[PDB]
Design a protein around this motif. Structure first.
Motif, short mmCIF file in Angstrom:
data_model
loop_
_atom_site.label_atom_id
_atom_site.label_comp_id
_atom_site.label_asym_id
_atom_site.label_seq_id
_atom_site.Cartn_x
_atom_site.Cartn_y
_atom_site.Cartn_z
N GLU A 2 3.37 27.77 -48.20
CA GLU A 2 2.36 28.62 -48.79
C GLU A 2 2.78 28.99 -50.20
OE1 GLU A 2 -0.48 29.28 -47.15
OE2 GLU A 2 0.19 28.31 -45.30
N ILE A 3 1.84 29.51 -50.98
CA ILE A 3 2.16 29.83 -52.37
C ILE A 3 1.46 31.13 -52.74
CG2 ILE A 3 0.33 28.42 -53.40
CD1 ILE A 3 2.45 27.68 -55.54
N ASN A 4 2.15 31.93 -53.52
CA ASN A 4 1.84 33.33 -53.74
C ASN A 4 2.16 33.67 -55.19
OD1 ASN A 4 1.23 35.98 -53.26
ND2 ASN A 4 2.91 36.33 -51.84
N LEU A 7 4.52 37.28 -56.38
CA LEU A 7 5.87 37.63 -55.98
C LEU A 7 6.77 37.99 -57.15
CD1 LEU A 7 6.29 35.11 -53.16
CD2 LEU A 7 5.89 37.53 -53.03
N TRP C 404 11.09 34.15 -57.97
CA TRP C 404 10.72 34.02 -56.57
C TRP C 404 9.24 33.72 -56.48
CZ3 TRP C 404 14.87 33.64 -53.82
CH2 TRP C 404 16.01 34.38 -54.15
N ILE C 405 8.89 32.57 -55.93
CA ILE C 405 7.52 32.22 -55.62
C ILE C 405 7.49 31.59 -54.23
CG2 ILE C 405 6.96 31.76 -58.05
CD1 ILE C 405 7.03 28.86 -57.46
N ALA C 406 6.29 31.52 -53.66
CA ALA C 406 5.91 30.54 -52.63
C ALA C 406 6.76 30.65 -51.36
CB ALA C 406 5.97 29.13 -53.21
N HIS C 407 6.54 31.73 -50.62
CA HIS C 407 7.10 31.81 -49.27
C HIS C 407 6.43 30.80 -48.35
CE1 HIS C 407 3.44 33.97 -48.13
NE2 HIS C 407 3.61 34.70 -49.21
N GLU C 408 7.17 30.37 -47.31
CA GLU C 408 6.73 29.30 -46.42
C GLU C 408 5.74 29.81 -45.38
OE1 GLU C 408 9.87 29.83 -47.17
OE2 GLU C 408 10.51 28.02 -48.22
N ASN C 409 5.37 28.92 -44.45
CA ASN C 409 4.18 29.10 -43.62
C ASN C 409 4.42 29.80 -42.29
OD1 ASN C 409 5.69 26.98 -42.71
ND2 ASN C 409 4.03 25.46 -42.75
N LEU C 416 12.04 32.96 -49.50
CA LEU C 416 11.29 32.70 -50.71
C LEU C 416 11.89 31.51 -51.45
CD1 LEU C 416 11.06 36.34 -52.06
CD2 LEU C 416 9.27 35.11 -50.85
N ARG C 494 -3.19 36.58 -50.21
CA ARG C 494 -1.84 36.61 -50.73
C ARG C 494 -1.41 38.02 -51.12
NH1 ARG C 494 -0.07 32.16 -48.50
NH2 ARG C 494 -1.14 30.30 -49.29
N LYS C 497 0.11 39.23 -47.96
CA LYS C 497 1.44 38.69 -47.72
C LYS C 497 2.48 39.28 -48.67
CE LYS C 497 -0.15 34.61 -45.39
NZ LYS C 497 -1.56 35.05 -45.31
N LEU C 498 2.05 39.69 -49.86
CA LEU C 498 2.93 40.49 -50.71
C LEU C 498 3.29 41.81 -50.04
CD1 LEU C 498 4.45 41.08 -53.29
CD2 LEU C 498 2.35 41.93 -54.27
N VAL C 501 6.07 40.99 -47.32
CA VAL C 501 7.39 40.69 -47.87
C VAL C 501 8.01 41.93 -48.50
CG1 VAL C 501 8.62 39.23 -49.51
CG2 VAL C 501 6.80 38.29 -48.15
#
Lengths: 701, 249, 511
Positions: A2-4, A7, C404-409, C416, C494, C497-498, C501
RNA sequence: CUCCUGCU
RNA sequence: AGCAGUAGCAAGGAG
């Protein structure tokens, strides 16, 4: 995976990752269709905030009048917003205000205001936005509507010799006393109009839709006034402009540091500071101008006898103003084939063809409808008194109740920051609810969904998010980098000026300056079809330049708009391109570009590529062709008066006699002065004299 | 014999029927609002119409007689330069603009044009003769001031400048005689020894006076010393997180 | 001097509009001149305090930041005007004299052979098939004769709608009938859709490098002195050398060329249907080539105002199996086989009718100004870094710093992906361009309120004990403006999801 | 049947 | 058909 994108905020500030959350690169939202429901929403929702039902009958206007002060039907839902102001309370805050700074404060500031009012010429009115012409009922620029107003004067009774502000305003009230006023309609016939229709027509404000606003999901209606409402409002904003300049709790980077440090120096051993970012909601439906009549009757208690009567007319025109209702709605059958248009006139008779929502808006605005307009008396719509409501904000922010628990802050048009000092958190409930009490009485409704607070500086004030030490900068509009479109010479230097002024004020780090400069270079070349000489473009302009490049000795002295490369930089944004480039040209090329004898320029930078494209073609093909005859005639007479007075565009040409008489007096003036030290010839003097006498006999006849 | 020409035009324009109700009905100030009649609304997309114009083949209005005195009907491969559609003023292409600039005659006017823009060549002359150094990377910032930003040497105040151009070019209706005249009238004695004989028009002279005498004061965020020599270099010398200044002289 | 014209009707107007306990303006002015305050004011204030019923909401005790309500309904389809990820393009080496769009169209009629572009009249799925089949055949035999003007047929007069507008009758004659032609008005709003699951694949596709090199026609570098021009030029060179190779550059160049051609064809030919290529131009092995993604058809724009909504028809070249969920508005046919040397895989032709507008051209065709916010962002990071270190560390800081970008599924909690700073500038150009496509009202309102909740997380990081007054209406507005724009629903997801985290460390939230 | 448009 | 987003465009006008 996934991409966010969010962050980055986990280990940064909101002074650095906050330009990422403005979607200014896309299109602004546009309106569509009529602007009726926004208007009816505004006026009917003004009457839902009135908290009353006390109607007073009127003799001037044929419709009922609802008062908006001191008649409160206090419902229990007081969290809901009210539009009713108690006058003893706000005058008590004015007397509480001037006892803080000085003693003769309002006499001083109002005397400086009148010290600038009497030295004002009414050409100041033409330096404004669009207004509403009441002759043809349209939107026109300011000079056109002023000339049509003066045209109705000098057609109606006598001529106009004012050339000041006060004599023009007195000419308007003199127009209110007349029993019949004549003007011209469309192919220029001349009609007449009554007395009550002139009162209903001077008080008409036009409503329309705000196009291109970043920041709302629902659309909003903006209203533009007439012409006879403009000068009095300009007077009031000169007065309240001087008062707002004199205050120190009004506004934007220094004053917050002075009040934050100073109120950090005003803490005891257990006290602390809490800031609250707020946003006053429903601001244009909860400022009644009757309170401006009372407060402006308190400021001018000791100024003069003229200003006391002249600063009390613009609220009185705002207290019973009309509202244009857009242009109606449209209806259609079940097959969705034929769609009739019903305007704002026949909406009364065709009432039973509306929706649920439209009828819900329309039956509670029914007892105030005129033929074309609606009768409003308690709103203060957009595009009006702006530097006066901020004075109400400063008046709420200097209340003194008698512990030592209190507040201060900072105010702008409808955005404030409030700072509280207290000891315990239930006392914070006490003081902050006292603040919403005083604003709720005085007519200011704070929004509870869009307000928050913290202990140190972490607030928001006109989109500058101030963190604990650092300061965020304002998101500018991107298309302002490219707005010129007038010349092969007056676009790119204007863009370097826009990067300049966006660099000096805001942050605008240097890489954005080099990048945004180079992009505006690219869009400049891409519009004007001019590419560099070694690029491979073969269109109708680069075949000439590619064939003729052998004649040029020094290649990098070419202009950018002729197929030269870029030489300006970050440290050279205040120099135009040519003035950097004149030290390197060929003598044939420099003597060839800089010819003033060229068929383009004959009929701020060097104007040697300046051309004028052809006009559009609805300028002789609509029904308004005689208006183009009017602009051609005005260009003729203005070229005549400029052709006599050789230097008239430097100084503003005042005078109150006539234009042709100063022309004839000037030709006789230069005829005698250049006669006796000069000419000397009888056929010339008597023949020019014969032309002046014959032209004067022609003009008097 | 120019008063005969102006008497011919003034005798011409009073012959009209509905134009007699235009002049000698208004005031002298009405000229200002007789200048402005721009009935178009806002021109809210000018560059859009500029690209829409420059994409056509003949967008431009240009004079006829000079281009038929020097131009060529078409260039050497199909490049159109003329039209015959409409006063006798001829539509044309910007290929005639660059074509004039590459294959046209020339008039020597270099000293005149290098004398119009003395402020700006003064800016280029002061830019070329400076020296820089390394950067510093520190925090910086100070408030907004009212700063005169140009190395002028008379320093008038946007009030003696309009009054100055009245009593230099055209004094027949210049101004009411004030007390601000006397040493400025010695400067009148100096300045008519400059602007008496030139081929440059009165508007361009009235433009070029007000840029060598006016210290342009604006409301700017300033830091360091407040000399006007380094205030046109305000946007270059320092930003918010970085700073560079090492000038010796 | 000091006399205003005392008229007769205005003085009866000023006496009428006074406050209620007053009779005339003179009584009002004489009371205001002799006004002295009292301390019954505090009784009115406190009597206003009592009847209030308003309490603040803390956050250490009632940390009620619940997640937002994404609509759990039917998945929102792909609504961008062109295809981004699923594209296929035919190439040729670029000839300098044949550069106008019609010349490019004819040269690719000889290059990619349209004689083999044989379509069956049965699509895989879609709505109207015979219309699109005869439309593709008719425009293909039009391009065979090298002239871009579709002759009037029933197919184009059905698709690019001619005669399809209501009869606007003014109310000057109306000729009413007894219970016949019963007319009124009616509105709805918008329809509601659900969470897009394909948006992750196209975000990840759009930031990956594509071997075709430079895509965007930038300009040349001005000469640099001994100043900070070394710095700015260096930064432009590194950032430009990263943003030229990605797929976001390819989509921006596609919008620039294609909307350039449709835009000038909206100027020069109203009232005539054109045939316009959909193409790019980028350098392949040093030799600059041009691509060819699809065929567009204009629909005779008479653009009176800034709106106008002319009809564009897009025929597209794809090599993937379609999808009735994402590719929902498309009308997939099948064209044939394309040899791809790594064997000879399939070739599907996509169909779509749509609309553009005049206000949605100057913001599309000039969308090269998405490199202005990106360099601002990376430059504020780096310049605040060396501003806090007070030492010229830029070139080595652009390599030894993580983002830090793009945490997994399957898992999110502090798992991260930290990348180098130039891959940060890749993700930033993708998000700015994604703002420039999907801008409606809904994205504007969503970005306002997400600036509020970002303020709450920054108040959460440094232990400042935030408070809010009324949270029910807050989520009523944010859940009001999340309906059907794909970027709006996605960025809300997203944002949640922020919150998860950050909920692994800070205490103002939920699960 | 023709003409006119391109913010009126 | 479609673009849309609280109401419009998908031509309009005249002789």
């Amino acid at each position: 995976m996934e991409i966010n994108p969010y962050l980055l905020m986990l280990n940064n500030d909101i002074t650095s990752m906050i330009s990422l959350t403005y979607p200014y690169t896309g299109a602004p939202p546009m309106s569509h269709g009529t602007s009726t429901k926004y208007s009816m929403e505004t006026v009917s929702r003004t009457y839902s905030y009135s908290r009353t039902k006390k109607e007073v009958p009127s003799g001037i206007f044929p419709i009922e009048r609802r008062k908006f002060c001191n008649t409160i039907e206090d419902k229990e839902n007081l969290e809901k917003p009210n539009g009713n102001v108690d006058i003893n309370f706000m005058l008590s805050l004015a007397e509480m205000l001037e006892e803080k700074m000085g003693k003769g404060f309002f006499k001083f500031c109002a005397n400086e205001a009148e010290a600038e009012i009497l030295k004002m010429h009414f050409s100041k009115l033409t330096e404004g936005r669009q207004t509403y012409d009441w002759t043809s009922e349209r939107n026109m620029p300011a000079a056109t509507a002023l000339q049509l107003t003066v045209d109705a004067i000098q057609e109606t009774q006598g001529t106009f010799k004012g050339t000041t502000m006060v004599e023009y305003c007195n000419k308007i009230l003199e127009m209110m006393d007349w029993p019949e006023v004549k003007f011209k309609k469309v192919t220029l016939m001349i009609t007449k109009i009554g007395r009550e229709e002139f009162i209903k027509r001077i008080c008409t404000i036009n409503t329309m839709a705000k196009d291109g606003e970043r920041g709302k999901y629902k659309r909003r209606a903006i209203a533009t006034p007439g012409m006879g409402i403009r000068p009095f409002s300009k007077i009031v904003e000169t007065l309240a402009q001087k008062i707002c300049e004199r205050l120190a709790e009004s506004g934007k980077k220094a004053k917050l540091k002075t009040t934050v440090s100073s109120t950090n120096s005003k803490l005891q051993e257990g006290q602390f500071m809490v800031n609250i970012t707020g946003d006053n909601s429903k601001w244009n439906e909860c400022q009644q101008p009757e309170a401006y009549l009372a407060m402006l009757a308190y400021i001018t208690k000791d100024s003069s006898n003229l200003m006391k009567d002249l600063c009390s007319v613009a609220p009185t025109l705002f207290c019973n103003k009309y509202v244009k209702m857009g242009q109606g709605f449209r209806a259609k059958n079940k097959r969705k084939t034929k769609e009739i248009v019903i305007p704002a006139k026949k909406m009364k008779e065709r009432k039973e063809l509306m929706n649920a929502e439209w009828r819900d808006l329309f039956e509670t605005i029914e007892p105030y409808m005129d033929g074309e307009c609606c009768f409003l008396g308690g709103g203060m719509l957009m595009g009006m008194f702006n530097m006066l409501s901020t004075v109400f904000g400063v008046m709420t922010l200097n209340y003194r109740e008698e512990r030592n628990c209190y507040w201060t802050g900072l105010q702008s048009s409808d955005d404030f920051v409030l700072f509280c000092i207290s000891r315990t958190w239930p006392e914070m409930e006490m003081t902050i609810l006292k603040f919403i009490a005083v604003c709720k009485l005085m007519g200011i409704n704070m929004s509870l969904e869009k307000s928050y607070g913290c202990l140190p500086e972490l607030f928001e004030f006109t989109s500058m998010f101030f963190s604990g030490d650092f300061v965020s900068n304002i998101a500018l509009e991107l298309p302002a980098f490219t707005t010129a479109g007038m010349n092969e010479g007056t676009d790119f230097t204007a863009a370097m000026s826009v990067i300049r002024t966006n660099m000096i004020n805001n942050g605008l780090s240097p890489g954005t300056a080099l990048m945004a400069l180079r992009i505006c270079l690219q869009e400049f070349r891409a519009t004007y079809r001019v590419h560099p000489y070694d690029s491979g473009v073969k269109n109708h302009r680069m075949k000439i330049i590619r064939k003729f490049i052998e004649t040029i000795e020094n290649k990098d002295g070419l202009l950018i708009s002729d197929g030269g490369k870029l030489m300006n930089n970050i440290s050279s944004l205040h120099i135009p391109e040519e003035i950097l480039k004149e030290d390197l040209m060929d003598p044939s090329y420099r003597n060839r570009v800089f010819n003033p004898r060229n068929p383009f320029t004959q009929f701020a930078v060097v104007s040697t590529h300046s051309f004028r494209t052809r006009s559009n073609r609805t300028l002789l093909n609509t029904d308004m062709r005689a208006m183009a005859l009017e602009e051609k005639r005005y260009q003729v007479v203005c070229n005549m008066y400029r052709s006599v007075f050789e230097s008239a565009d430097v100084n503003t040409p005042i005078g109150s006699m006539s234009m042709g008489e100063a022309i004839e007096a000037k030709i006789l003036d230069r005829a005698r002065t250049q006669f006796e030290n000069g000419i000397i010839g009888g056929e010339e003097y008597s023949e020019i004299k014969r032309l002046i006498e014959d032209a004067k006999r022609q003009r008097l006849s | 014999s120019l008063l005969l020409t102006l008497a011919k035009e003034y005798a011409n324009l009073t012959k009209d029927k509905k134009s007699c109700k235009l002049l000698s009905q208004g005031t002298v100030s009405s000229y200002t609002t007789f200048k402005k009649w721009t009935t178009s609304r806002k021109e809210k997309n000018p560059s859009l119409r500029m690209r829409w114009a420059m994409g056509s083949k003949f967008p431009i209005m240009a004079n006829r007689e000079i281009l038929e005195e020097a131009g060529i009907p078409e260039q050497w491969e199909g490049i159109d330069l003329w039209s015959k559609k409409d006063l006798g003023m001829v539509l044309a292409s910007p290929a005639a603009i660059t074509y004039w600039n590459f294959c046209g005659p020339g008039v020597d006017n270099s000293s005149v044009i290098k004398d119009v823009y003395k402020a700006k060549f003064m800016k280029k002359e002061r830019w070329r003769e400076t020296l820089w150094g390394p950067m510093n990377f520190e925090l910086v910032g100070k408030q907004r001031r009212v700063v005169e930003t140009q190395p002028v040497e008379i320093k008038l105040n946007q009030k003696e400048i309009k009054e100055l151009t009245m009593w230099v070019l055209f004094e027949d209706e210049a101004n009411l005689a004030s007390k601000f005249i006397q040493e400025n009238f010695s400067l009148v004695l100096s300045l008519r020894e400059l602007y008496k004989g030139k081929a440059v028009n009165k508007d361009v002279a009235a433009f070029m006076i007000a840029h060598q005498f006016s210290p342009e004061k604006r409301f700017l965020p300033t830091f360091g010393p407040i000399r006007p020599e380094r205030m046109e270099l305000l946007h270059c010398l320092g930003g918010d997180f970085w700073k560079i200044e090492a000038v010796t002289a | 001097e000091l006399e205003m014209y005392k008229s007769k009707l205005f003085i009866a107007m000023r006496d009428e509009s006074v406050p209620l306990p007053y009779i005339n303006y003179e009584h009002l002015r004489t009371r205001c001149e002799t006004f002295k305050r009292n301390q019954a004011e505090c009784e009115a204030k406190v009597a206003d305090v009592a009847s209030r019923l308003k309490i603040k909401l803390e956050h250490l005790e009632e940390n009620k930041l619940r997640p937002l309500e994404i609509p759990k309904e039917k998945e929102a389809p792909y609504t961008h005007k062109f295809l981004m990820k699923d594209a296929w393009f035919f190439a040729k080496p670029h000839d300098s004299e044949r550069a106008q769009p019609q010349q490019i169209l004819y040269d690719f009629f000889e290059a990619a052979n349209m004689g083999f572009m044989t379509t069956s009249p049965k699509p895989i799925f879609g709505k109207q098939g015979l219309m699109y089949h005869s439309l593709w055949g008719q425009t293909k035999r039009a391009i065979k004769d090298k002239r871009n003007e579709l002759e009037p047929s029933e197919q184009r007069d059905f698709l690019c709608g001619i005669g399809r507008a209501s009869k606007k009758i003014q109310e000057d004659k109306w000729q009413e009938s007894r219970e016949e032609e019963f007319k009124q008005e009616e509105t709805k709003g918008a329809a509601k859709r659900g969470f897009p699951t394909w948006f992750n694949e196209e975000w990840l596709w759009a930031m990956r490098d594509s071997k075709i090199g430079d895509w965007i026609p930038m300009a040349e570098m001005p000469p640099c002195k001994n100043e900070m021009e070394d710095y700015a030029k260096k930064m432009c060179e590194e950032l430009e050398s990263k943003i030229q190779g990605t797929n976001c550059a390819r989509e921006m160049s596609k919008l620039i060329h294609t909307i350039g051609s449709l835009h000038t064809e909206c100027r020069n030919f109203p009232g005539k249907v054109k045939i316009v290529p959909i193409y790019c131009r980028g350098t392949l092995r040093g030799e600059s080539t041009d691509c060819l993604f699809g065929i567009a058809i204009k629909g005779k724009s008479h653009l009176n105002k800034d709106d106008g909504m002319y009809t564009v028809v897009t025929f597209e070249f794809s090599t993937e199996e379609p999808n009735p969920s994402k590719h929902e508005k498309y009308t997939v046919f099948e064209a044939g086989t394309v040899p791809v040397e790594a064997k000879e895989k399939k070739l599907f032709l996509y169909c779509r009718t749509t609309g553009m507008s005049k206000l949605k051209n100057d913001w599309f065709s000039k969308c090269r100004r998405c490199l202005i916010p990106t360099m601002e962002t990376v430059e504020q990071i780096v310049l605040k870094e060396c501003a806090l270190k007070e030492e010229n560390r830029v070139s080595e800081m652009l390599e030894n710093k993580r983002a830090w970008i793009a945490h997994e599924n399957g898992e999110n909690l502090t798992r991260l992906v930290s990348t180098k700073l130039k891959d940060l500038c890749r993700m930033l150009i993708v998000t700015q361009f994604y703002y420039c496509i999907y801008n409606d009202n809904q994205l504007e309102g969503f970005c306002n309120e997400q600036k509020k909740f970002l303020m709450f997380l920054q108040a959460d990081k440094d232990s400042k004990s935030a408070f809010t007054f009324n949270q029910k209406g807050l989520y009523e507005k944010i859940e009001e403006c999340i309906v059907s724009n794909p970027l709006c629903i996605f960025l809300a997801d997203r944002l949640n999801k922020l919150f998860l985290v950050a909920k692994s460390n800070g205490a103002k939230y939920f699960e």
